[PDB]
Amino acid sequence: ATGGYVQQATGQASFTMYSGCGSPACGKAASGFTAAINQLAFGSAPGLGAGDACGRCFALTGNHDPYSPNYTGPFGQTIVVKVTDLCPVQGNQEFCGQTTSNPTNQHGMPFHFDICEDTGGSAKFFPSGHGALTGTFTEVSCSQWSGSDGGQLWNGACLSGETAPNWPSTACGNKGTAPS
Ligand SMILES: OC[C@H]1O[C@@H](O[C@H]2[C@H](O)[C@@H](O)[C@H](O[C@H]3[C@H](O)[C@@H](O)[C@H](O[C@H]4[C@H](O)[C@@H](O)[C@H](O[C@H]5[C@H](O)[C@@H](O)[C@H](O)O[C@@H]5CO)O[C@@H]4CO)O[C@@H]3CO)O[C@@H]2CO)[C@H](O)[C@@H](O)[C@@H]1O
Secondary structure, eight states, rough: TTTSOOOOEEEEEEEEEOOOOSOOTTTTOOSEEEEEEEHHHHOOOSSSSOOOTTTTTEEEEEEOTTTTTTTOOOOOOOOOEEEEEOOOOOTTTHOOOOOOOOOOOOOOSSEEEEETTTTTTTHHHHHHTTOOEEEEEEEEOOOGGGBBBBSSTTTTTGGGGGOSSSSOOOOOOOHHHHOO
């Protein structure tokens, strides 16, 4: 995509959970299940505002625990998240360190979703005792997502991806160049 970002409607991903998603990189939070996506897919860098992932909805499915490879299940539910946030390369090498020159993380995954705990998504997705998984994602219509968007936190905030056709397409737009 523009800027060299890798933005695909379906693929393989890793998954973690995080706390504190009330002031996210897209500039609007949301009351439903939300996630951060790795920088190479988000379409922006820290401090540059919203990227083209903002507001898009994805169905997430876990099918493997990389820390316990003998575990065969059960896994959690498939959930639909809205992307509101950025998982930056800096400080998150293991999971969100994908760059244009090495577009997979330490678990071999080209994408990463960090699911926000605050609003309930991680309790539906992660089985107790297994807080990091790999699996798949697929972009869906936000008709499949429940919740409501919060107010704009700063000028330029954007969740317009929530009404966009699936990638490839442009809604909020990408900013800057993808990390090398
Ligand atoms: O940077 C991205 C994002 O990270 C979030 O934090 C992540 C963190 O990055 C992950 O490293 C961390 O992963 C831990 C898993 O949640 C947790 O489930 C897993 O637990 C292992 C455990 O370590 C292991 O000892 C245990 O082994 C047992 C076997 O399963 C059994 O078969 C055997 O009989 O007995 C052994 C030992 O008793 O397995 C479990 C489960 O597999 O450990 C992982 C490594 O610590 O997850 C974090 C949360 O998602 C961070 O919150 C975000 O802010 C950040 O953006």
